[PDB]
Design an enzyme around this catalytic site. Structure first.
Site, PDB file in Angstrom:
ATOM      1  N   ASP A   1     -12.565  -8.625 -11.583  1.00 27.23           N
ATOM      2  CA  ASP A   1     -11.655  -9.761 -11.705  1.00 27.23           C
ATOM      3  C   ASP A   1     -12.423 -11.078 -11.605  1.00 27.23           C
ATOM      4  O   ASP A   1     -12.104 -11.937 -10.785  1.00 27.23           O
ATOM      5  CB  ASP A   1     -10.480  -9.667 -10.741  1.00 27.23           C
TER       6      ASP A   1
ATOM      7  N   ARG B   1      -8.904 -17.995 -12.831  1.00 22.50           N
ATOM      8  CA  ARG B   1      -7.705 -17.881 -12.013  1.00 22.50           C
ATOM      9  C   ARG B   1      -8.028 -17.263 -10.645  1.00 22.50           C
ATOM     10  O   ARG B   1      -7.260 -17.427  -9.700  1.00 22.50           O
ATOM     11  CB  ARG B   1      -6.647 -17.056 -12.765  1.00 22.50           C
ATOM     12  N   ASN B   2      -9.152 -16.539 -10.542  1.00 24.60           N
ATOM     13  CA  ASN B   2      -9.510 -15.825  -9.319  1.00 24.60           C
ATOM     14  C   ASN B   2     -10.797 -16.412  -8.746  1.00 24.60           C
ATOM     15  O   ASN B   2     -11.569 -15.724  -8.076  1.00 24.60           O
ATOM     16  CB  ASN B   2      -9.625 -14.323  -9.566  1.00 24.60           C
TER      17      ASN B   2
ATOM     18  N   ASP C   1     -10.799 -12.157  -4.635  1.00 19.40           N
ATOM     19  CA  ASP C   1     -10.801 -10.757  -4.234  1.00 19.40           C
ATOM     20  C   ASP C   1     -10.856  -9.826  -5.449  1.00 19.40           C
ATOM     21  O   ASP C   1     -10.650 -10.234  -6.595  1.00 19.40           O
ATOM     22  CB  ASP C   1      -9.661 -10.446  -3.272  1.00 19.40           C
TER      23      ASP C   1
END
Length: 255
Positions: free
Chosen positions: A130, A134-135, A148
């Site tokens: 990921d 956005r992360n 995470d």
């Protein structure tokens, strides 16, 4: 960390396992840290509850300057995972707001920082899945932090899409997509396609186009990361070295 040391203020968002709350933690020396308090739905399977804890234990132990910090764990139900809350929020939105001010120098810096986080993950053969803006959280204007662990079809290597195969090499693919997002000021990859159409285009040999402000040397680097053959992709240790070179060059051009 005793529960009393944490005060919940408002809802932050929904996470996979349950609601996330915005809070404040008062530490032993009396300081006040802004936190995100992750919870696990009471309806969850024992396997889900274990996963939630086991992911938490990983975040607890990483302790890396470009990976989000875990403050503490309250195991006693209702279980709380207490994460540092970063003021500037998600990198994607941050890039959008500040597209007028941000220069290539800083965009390469963020890429470099994320790359270093991933080199550490590579070293323990931990696959993230990921790596997207956005992360990624903005701690400061010159410091970003990978969020995470991980579908995000538009971000995924061919072997991940076709087969749900995930390796460090698939992470390298995804990291390049993430770099493309950064240099594009938070554009969604393949924003012009349906998820269905992506593997088709990838199979043909088509790739994301060079962002306007991306230096050619960096695009060439992205293109290597998007080699259909995962064995042919660079390792993160190599990428840190490359991105370090580009960063320093862009810095000296800027000055």
């Amino acid at each position: 960390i005793a529960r009393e040391d944490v005060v919940l203020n408002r809802i932050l968002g929904e996470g996979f396992f349950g609601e996330v709350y915005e809070g404040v933690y008062t530490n032993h020396k009396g300081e006040k840290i802004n936190v995100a308090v992750k919870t696990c739905k009471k309806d969850c399977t024992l396997d889900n509850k274990e996963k939630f804890m086991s992911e938490a234990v990983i975040m607890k132990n990483l302790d890396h300057p470009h990976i989000v910090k875990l403050i503490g764990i309250i195991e006693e139900e209702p279980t709380w995972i207490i994460m540092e809350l970063y003021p500037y929020g998600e990198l994607g939105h941050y890039l959008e707001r500040n597209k007028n001010s941000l220069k290539v120098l800083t965009l390469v810096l963020y890429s470099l920082q994320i790359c270093k986080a991933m080199a550490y993950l590579e070293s323990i053969n931990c696959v993230h899945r990921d790596i997207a803006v956005r992360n990624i959280l903005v701690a400061s204007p010159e410091c970003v932090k990978l969020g995470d662990f991980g579908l995000p079809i538009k971000w995924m290597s061919p072997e991940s899409i076709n087969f749900r195969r995930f390796t460090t090499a698939s992470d390298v693919w995804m990291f390049a997509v993430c770099m493309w997002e950064i240099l594009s000021f938070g554009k969604q990859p393949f924003f012009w396609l349906e998820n269905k159409d992506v593997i088709g285009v990838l199979e043909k040999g088509d790739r994301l186009p060079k962002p306007d402000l991306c230096p050619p040397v960096l695009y060439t680097l992205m293109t290597r990361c998007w080699d259909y053959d995962p064995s042919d992709r660079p390792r993160f240790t190599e990428l840190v070295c490359s991105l370090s070179d580009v960063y320093q060059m862009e810095k000296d051009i800027a000055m």
